[PDB]
Design a protein around this ligand. Structure first.
Ligand SMILES: [Mg+2]
Ligand SMILES: [Zn+2]
Lengths: 99, 1318, 50, 83
RNA sequence: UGGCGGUAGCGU
DNA sequence: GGAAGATCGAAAAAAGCACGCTACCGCCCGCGTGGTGGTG
DNA sequence: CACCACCACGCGGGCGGTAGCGTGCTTTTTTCGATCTTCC
């Protein structure tokens, strides 16, 4: 099985799982630990944001590769936004302070 | 974009601000209309338009519901400890019996007798109403709790509670009040208010996060969130209608209780009562269920996620591949590199639009293969196996396009992947940025990884066929073809072998030239004639120039090949080592194929001497059984003898079979016979180390030996049949027991290993190297570890790749041997070992002075590269992975009277006081005396511990030979050793009241036995037994050097045989006191969790004399009285805990009072951080070495430092920290340094030891603790305390989605910090 | 999950899944059958006077 | 054409800023249209960047001063164009 | 155009 | 020299239980009342 | 054209019942009534 770009989940905005439906492999926690054990920082950010969650990042990366530029815009993962909204649905306020 | 994340409980105004509308109707979607209703859960007028690049408002716009009556938040009520109950200082039972309308609570006491917070039931309520009525206020429900919270004021309550704590003395009350004070202070320093803890406005999630997907059959999904919201809306609307109708108390009370229950179920289903059951007969998924747990958002979509540009396929051996190359299927590569192919096609102009690009791609035009070859020329791909146990689980390779559907993997990397070719699958990821390709080529490339980061051992070794091929090539017969000729060089030998004129094993003499490295660094050639074999000469052609010829002039087994590769790496470098490894693999494969080695039924030769030995063993077992029938031997000893004789028979059979196998080949030389090493394929495989060991070959050819039934015992009759022969039904059935035991063990080990690895990663994820040198002179003293007869770890292994903490003095000369701050590489280790150095002080991570990380010098070598560790290394993650990787190799199932000297050297004694007995032998009157076997070089060769009242064969400072006994003792009972010779008399233990008289079994002597204090009456327990040693003048003679006279107080159950008035010598025995862990992975888990043992060892907190007292109820009380200090110290010890120390002895700090396992917390408290670190690393290393696993102590020290991160204050000083507060040690250090700089006085602190889970949960960053586990409690505490979290970590940045400050992102984070500071 | 001695002739000591459910799932022996009460029984040949 | 970068690692000294400088150079030639300082034997931008650091033609210091050189040059060109 | 649950299997 | 403090043993409650993948099925209100349409 | 049959439907929730249901794990924290102790 192999996938470059296909359908994504409608809630977490992440690629689907399985072979019957076009889906990508899961970069689990253990793989993230292995990348952290290396000097893999840009690779990890690429795994987390530009390929899985950041829709704008995904589109920009696709366009940049199409035109021949291998540059990334990490952006903001959608999964963290979903988690923030879920936590805010309770009686708990959470926000990203700027200062 | 942002710097930190703030979490706090939400006020109703903020909740209203979030919402873009009010939800009033519980109508999600009409089935017929397909249009959401107004004011519904999916209303377009509230959450934005359904349709329009994308409608992101529906994903972010929230709603709100105005609750008719206030409802308590379940998280702040039921999550222990209860925030509302702690804040109100009221037991939780009253709290949720008032919230759910079962009892009334007073708010305003007024002039009435009842106080403010009282619980009144119905009868009490109307009794108070009739008796007083008037103006007192007693309310019911959640609004009552809200009013109670609003009425209270935090400032005066906190100040009065602090002033009470200043004048309080109760320890439990001290802890309760310090917790309450901390809670009140956290509430008052934040903008949060207690009244906000009671919900009045309910937030509503955006519809897109709880979508109603179509089922393509006319119906929809479940959407448990929508169901819970609908139930809450129904309850709220019913309550509103009831209030508008002016309902009686009972109806509104029931409706409010049901609404509160519905709100609780929506917030946390099943938290208090029974969970709401949906259409699937199972609890519905609440809001809290989608945050916590393994299936929650944190562990399923933030820490890990599915990624594009990835694929998966089975693996296949590529023998032709290079070390940096891997075979990729053409279809998989074409699918993965589609955007690159589009870009190249558009750049070269074969298509006008990208649609035309896909149209050329999927049709598979001829030029598409050329484009794909161009785009993958230098594009590394990351190959990863499913269990990523350690760092080497994912590696970068250069793709080579192949035909098929299977990924071709280089054999030499398989050991790194722990992958075998029997159905395993690997996943391939394609980096698609320049930075990622750079780190794939420079960091994750297979050529870079040559040494294991866990211990520094090489990871690329030949395993199965290369070893066999090299072993066959490098071997010699005595009469092979072409033997004795002289060859001009290796090329002539290769030509002769290929032409068939000379055999591969022919012993010839060839002229070879070898290059040696001189001082200046170049290569000098030396040509000479060497007697070798044709195969060795052929193999010499792939060896690089710098290596000598002695490496290949041998049999070249697995160990020899590994040593040759290590020498090549050490002498030549890295790239020549890679080329040499590839050539070695190629030659081994080729010559293994050419050899044609095969396994046949005749290879496993069975000797008849084995059958004779088996028959003799049967005869011996029959004789033993006949002796047992005679009744001269019991069952246990006869079973032991049977087991021993069967083991001896199995050993004899194995020895005979091995002797037959190794030298079976008796071949003829030119004149006569000669016995040489056999060429049996099984024997060659066993000897070369390619596959199999002595035990497996012995099972194949000799008897299988004894087998154990599942309970752990050994069966009397072993399996006397080989695998070549026919095992009967009994033998197979017996072997199935062990097979099933092992299979179940390896099936159930994985879950615990993974859990331990996850905990270790989470406890040490944020530790990185941030500085270069602390400048601290404090370190740890490393010495070789010896436990009675063996030196397990030499000093060289322990101190390799570690910087020194102080100037190492040369022994006996007082001259410095190494500088103070030098890294101990191989040359320094050789210098240390050649100068007879025993103990070396080296800087350690656990003593690193750098805050928020560690320094490079205090860590040491990288352990994966020759140079020192680099700044930014994620040493914590590497340490956790290194510790957790060998977890699957451990086990879980739970299954002396003299000292023997084996070496020659002097004997030294430590912390010993002793006395010469009547015979002149030394008897030790100490409890912790240690003996060391110091060799002629001064090294501590052996270490032993002697017990109380142990005789010594010879004194200190004398040389003894091996095999001699130097100390003897009786472990059955502990003796009492006297120090003064004189008449012995009895005092205060007359018979019948406190002691008893017992007749001897056969001698008939009447011996006095000290009765137990509980057993004896009150008239005897008041006094204590006293043996008094008196001189000629009449009274008790004082001990030399001590004013307190020599009277011995007999402990319980003491037995004395000699009568009073009998003269005794010094060192004699007065009384005799009767004297009475399994699993590897569980032991490691307990050690890393700091779990208190079930039978903790009692230790002396302070140094001083010991005394007894009252027996209290049924367990003894102990008093520790120091000579100079005061005597407030009393302990509470049970009878069943043995008392190692007697009544009239002197003990020091951290002395062993009761035998048993030592609690790590007590060790840390009484001996310091270094002692507990040494204990933990020793235990972990022992457990790992029991299974033959080599792990460096740096990782264990890193973990230990991570555990020790909190300290409890003792003296407040000028600091603002509370007396009972437990705060991060770095904060205390910074505050103390600032106070010392300002001239004030610091705060005394005591470091505490926490388990891995507790340490990870109790961290500054609440996000990491929430993502680890126990999300509800962590989130509740963070919201209540209003914690602000700066990421400054690996897990936090991974969850957020930014660069981790470890690798290439460390410089970026440093630049960001500098910009923020400036 | 262990192989009890009573499994002789009633439960195959080797035919069992390799994984989480090891020992919990077994295969009936060739000659094994069930009592009227549900207990497994195995055949034997009666040996009289040797 | 590249298998090991040990010499490049020792030239940079720490194996971390080597990746950063190589990525910066690769972006400079790939996006900025810069000319490589070494002949290209049909190699990618990353491999060329790694290959031209081996003999010391590219490191952080000289790259920074060279970037400053053309940024001063373009500032002066803009100033002259304005005048 | 998704989720939950159960079952069996594969690689460790 | 009898009730707070300290202990303490038992009962309850909460938290956790490796990763990746493949295939299949079963299910995704309710019910039982009443408004309203058809009807002998 | 008021009576039966079909589909909205409404609030309802644990279901079905003239009551229970539950039944092979380990560790940590709370807590709560019972017991012994000691001094104000
Ligand atoms: Mg396998
Ligand atoms: Zn340091």
């Amino acid at each position: 099985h192999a996938r470059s770009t296909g359908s994504y989940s409608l809630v977490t905005q992440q690629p689907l799982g399985g072979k019957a439906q076009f889906g990508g492999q899961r970069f689990g926690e253990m793989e993230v630990w292995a990348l952290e054990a290396y000097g893999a920082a840009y690779t990890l950010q690429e795994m987390l944001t530009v390929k899985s969650d950041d829709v704008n990042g995904r589109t920009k990366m696709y366009k940049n590769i199409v035109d021949g530029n291998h540059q990334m815009e990490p952006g903001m993962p959608e999964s963290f936004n979903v988690l923030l909204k879920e936590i805010r649905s309770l009686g708990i306020n959470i926000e990203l302070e700027d200062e | 974009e942002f710097d930190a994340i703030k979490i706090a409980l939400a006020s109703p105004d903020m909740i209203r601000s979030w919402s873009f509308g009010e939800v009033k109707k519980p109508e999600t979607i009409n089935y017929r209309t397909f249009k959401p209703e107004r004011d519904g859960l999916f209303c377009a007028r509230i959450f934005g338009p359904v349709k329009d690049t994308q409608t992101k408002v529906r994903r972010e716009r929230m709603g709100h519901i105005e609750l008719a009556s206030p409802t308590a938040h379940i998280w702040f009520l039921k999550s222990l400890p209860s925030r509302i109950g702690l804040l109100l200082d009221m037991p939780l039972r009253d709290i949720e019996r008032v919230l759910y309308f079962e009892s009334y609570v007073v708010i305003e006491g007024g002039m009435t007798n009842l106080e403010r917070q009282q619980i009144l039931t119905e009868e009490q309520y109307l009794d108070a109403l009739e008796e007083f009525g008037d103006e007192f206020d007693a309310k019911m429900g959640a609004e009552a709790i809200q009013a109670l919270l609003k009425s209270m004021d935090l400032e005066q309550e906190c100040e009065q509670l602090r002033e009470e704590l200043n004048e309080t003395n109760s320890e439990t009350k001290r802890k309760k009040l310090t917790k309450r004070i901390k809670l009140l202070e956290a509430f008052v320093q934040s903008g949060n208010k207690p009244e906000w803890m009671i919900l009045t406005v309910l937030p509503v999630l955006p519809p897109d996060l709880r979508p109603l997907v179509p089922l393509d059959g006319g119906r929809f999904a479940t959407s448990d969130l929508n169901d819970l919201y609908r139930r809450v809306i129904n309850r709220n609307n019913r309550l509103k209608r009831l209030l508008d109708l002016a309902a009686p108390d009972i109806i509104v009370r029931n409706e409010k209780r049901m609404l509160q229950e519905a709100v609780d179920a929506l917030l946390d289903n099943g938290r208090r009562g029974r969970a709401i059951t949906g259409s699937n007969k199972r609890p519905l998924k609440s809001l809290a269920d989608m945050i916590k747990g393994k299936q929650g958002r944190f562990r399923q979509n933030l820490l890990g996620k599915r990624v594009d540009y990835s694929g998966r396929s089975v693996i296949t051996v590529g023998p032709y591949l290079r070390l940096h190359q891997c075979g990729l299927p053409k279809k998989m590569a074409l699918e993965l590199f589609k955007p690159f192919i589009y870009g190249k096609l558009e750049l070269r102009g074969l298509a006008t639009t990208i649609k035309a690009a896909k149209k050329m791609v999927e049709r598979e035009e001829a030029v598409v293969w050329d484009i794909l070859d161009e785009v993958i020329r230098e594009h590394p791909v990351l190959l990863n196996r499913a269990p990523t146990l350690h760092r080497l689980g994912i590696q970068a390779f250069e793709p080579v396009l192949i035909e098929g559907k299977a990924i071709q993997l280089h054999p030499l990397v398989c050991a790194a992947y722990n992958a075998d070719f029997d159905g395993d699958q690997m996943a391939v990821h394609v980096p698609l940025t320049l930075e990622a390709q750079l780190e794939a080529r420079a960091l994750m490339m297979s050529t870079n990884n040559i040494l294991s980061p866990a211990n520094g051992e090489p990871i690329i070794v030949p395993s199965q066929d290369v070893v066999l091929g090299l072993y066959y090539m490098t071997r010699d017969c005595v009469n092979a073809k072409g033997e004795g000729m002289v060859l001009t060089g290796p090329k002539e030998a290769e030509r002769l072998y290929r032409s068939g004129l000379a055999s591969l094993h022919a012993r010839v003499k060839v002229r070879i030239t070898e290059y040696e490295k001189d001082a200046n660094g170049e290569l000098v050639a030396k040509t000479s004639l060497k007697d070798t074999t044709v195969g060795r000469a052929i193999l010499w052609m792939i060896v690089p120039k710098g290596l000598p010829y002695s490496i290949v002039n041998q049999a070249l087994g697995k160990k020899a090949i590994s040593k040759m590769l290590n020498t090549c790496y050490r002498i030549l470098g890295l790239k020549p080592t890679v080329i040499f490894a590839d050539q070695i693999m190629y030659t081994g494969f080729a010559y293994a194929a050419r050899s044609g080695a095969s396994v046949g039924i005749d290879d496993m030769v069975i000797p008849e001497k084995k059958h004779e030995i088996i028959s003799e063993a049967e005869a011996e077992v029959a004789e033993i059984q006949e002796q047992f029938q005679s009744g001269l031997v019991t069952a246990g000893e006869r079973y032991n003898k049977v087991i021993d004789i069967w083991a001896a028979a199995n050993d004899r059979v194995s020895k005979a079979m091995m002797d037959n196998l190794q030298t079976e080949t008796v071949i003829n030389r030119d004149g006569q016979e000669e016995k040489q090493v056999s060429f049996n394929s099984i024997y060659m495989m066993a000897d070369s180390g390619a596959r199999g060991s002595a035990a497996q070959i012995r099972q194949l050819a000799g008897m299988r030996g004894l087998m154990a039934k599942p309970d752990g015992s050994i069966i009397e009759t072993p399996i006397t049949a080989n695998f070549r022969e026919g095992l009967n039904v009994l033998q197979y059935f017996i072997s199935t027991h062990g097979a099933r035991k092992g299979l179940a063990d390896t099936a159930l080990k994985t879950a615990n290993s993974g859990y331990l690895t996850r905990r270790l990663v989470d406890v040490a994820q944020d530790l990185v190297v941030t500085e270069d040198d602390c400048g601290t002179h404090e370190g740890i003293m490393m010495t070789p570890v010896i436990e009675g007869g063996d030196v397990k770890e030499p000093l060289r292994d322990r101190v390799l790749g570690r910087v020194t903490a102080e100037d190492v003095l040369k022994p006996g000369t007082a001259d410095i041997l190494v500088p103070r701050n030098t890294l101990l590489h191989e040359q320094w280790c050789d210098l240390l070992e050649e100068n007879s150095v025993d103990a070396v002080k080296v800087r350690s991570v656990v003593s690193c002075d750098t805050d928020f990380g560690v320094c490079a010098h205090c860590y040491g070598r990288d352990l994966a590269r020759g140079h020192i560790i680099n700044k930014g290394e994620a040493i914590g993650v590497i340490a956790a992975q290194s510790i957790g990787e060998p977890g699957t190799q451990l086990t879980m199932r739970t299954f002396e009277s003299s000292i023997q000297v084996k070496n020659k050297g002097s004997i030294k004694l430590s912390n010993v006081k002793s006395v010469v007995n009547s015979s002149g032998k030394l008897v030790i009157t100490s409890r912790n005396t240690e003996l060391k076997l110091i060799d002629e070089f001064g090294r501590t060769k052996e270490s032993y511990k002697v017990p109380y009242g142990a005789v010594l064969a010879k004194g200190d400072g004398e040389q003894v030979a091996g095999g001699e006994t130097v100390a003897n003792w009786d472990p059955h009972t502990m003796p009492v050793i006297t120090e003064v010779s004189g008449f012995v008399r009895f005092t205060d233990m007359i018979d019948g009241q406190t002691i008893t008289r017992q007749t001897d079994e056969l001698t008939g002597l009447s011996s006095l036995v000290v009765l137990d204090s509980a057993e004896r009456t009150a008239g005897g327990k008041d006094l204590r037994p006293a043996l008094k040693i008196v001189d000629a003048q009449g009274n008790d003679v004082l001990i030399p050097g001590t004013d307190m006279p020599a009277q011995y107080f007999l402990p319980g159950k003491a037995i004395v045989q000699l009568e009073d008035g009998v003269q005794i010598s010094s060192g004699d025995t007065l009384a005799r006191i009767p004297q009475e862990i399994t699993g590897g992975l569980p032991r490691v888990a307990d050690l890393f969790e700091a779990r208190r043992p079930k039978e903790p060892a009692i230790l002396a907190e302070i140094s001083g004399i010991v005394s007894f007292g009252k027996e209290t109820k049924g367990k003894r009380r102990l008093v520790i009285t120091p000579v100079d200090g005061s005597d407030p110290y009393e302990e509470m010890i049970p009878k069943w805990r043995q008392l190692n120390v007697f009544e009239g002895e002197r003990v020091e700090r951290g002395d062993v009072i009761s035998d048993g396992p030592e609690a790590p917390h007590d060790i840390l408290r009484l001996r310091g951080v270094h002692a507990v670190t040494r204990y933990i690393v020793n235990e972990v290393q022992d457990v790992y070495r029991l299974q033959g696993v080599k792990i460096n102590d740096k990782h264990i020290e890193v973990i230990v430092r991570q555990m020790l991160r909190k300290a409890t204050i003792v003296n407040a000083g000028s600091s603002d920290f509370l007396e009972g507060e437990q705060v991060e040690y770095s904060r205390v250090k910074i505050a103390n340094r600032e106070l010392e700089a300002n001239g004030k006085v610091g705060a005394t602190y005591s470091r505490d030891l926490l388990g891995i889970t507790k340490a990870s949960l109790a961290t500054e960053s609440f996000i990491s603790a929430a993502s680890f586990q126990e999300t509800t409690r962590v989130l509740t505490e963070a919201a209540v305390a209003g914690k602000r979290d700066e990421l400054r970590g690996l897990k936090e940045n991974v969850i957020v989605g930014r660069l981790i400050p470890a690798g290439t992102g460390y410089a970026y984070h440093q630049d960001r910090m500098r910009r923020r500071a400036a | 999950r262990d192989v009890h001695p009573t499994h002789y002739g009633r439960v195959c000591p080797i035919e069992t899944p390799e994984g989480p459910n090891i020992g919990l799932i077994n295969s009936l022996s060739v000659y094994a059958q069930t009592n009227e009460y549900g207990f497994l029984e195995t055949p034997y040949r009666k040996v009289t006077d040797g | 054409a590249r298998v090991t970068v040990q010499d490049a690692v020792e030239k940079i000294g720490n194996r971390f800023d080597l990746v950063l400088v190589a990525a910066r150079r690769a972006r400079q030639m790939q996006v900025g249209g810069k000319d490589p300082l070494v002949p290209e034997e049909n190699d990618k931008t990353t491999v060329i960047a790694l290959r031209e650091i081996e003999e010391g033609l590219i490191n952080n210091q000289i790259l920074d001063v060279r970037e400053r050189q053309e940024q001063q040059e373009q500032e002066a060109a803009e100033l002259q164009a304005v005048t």
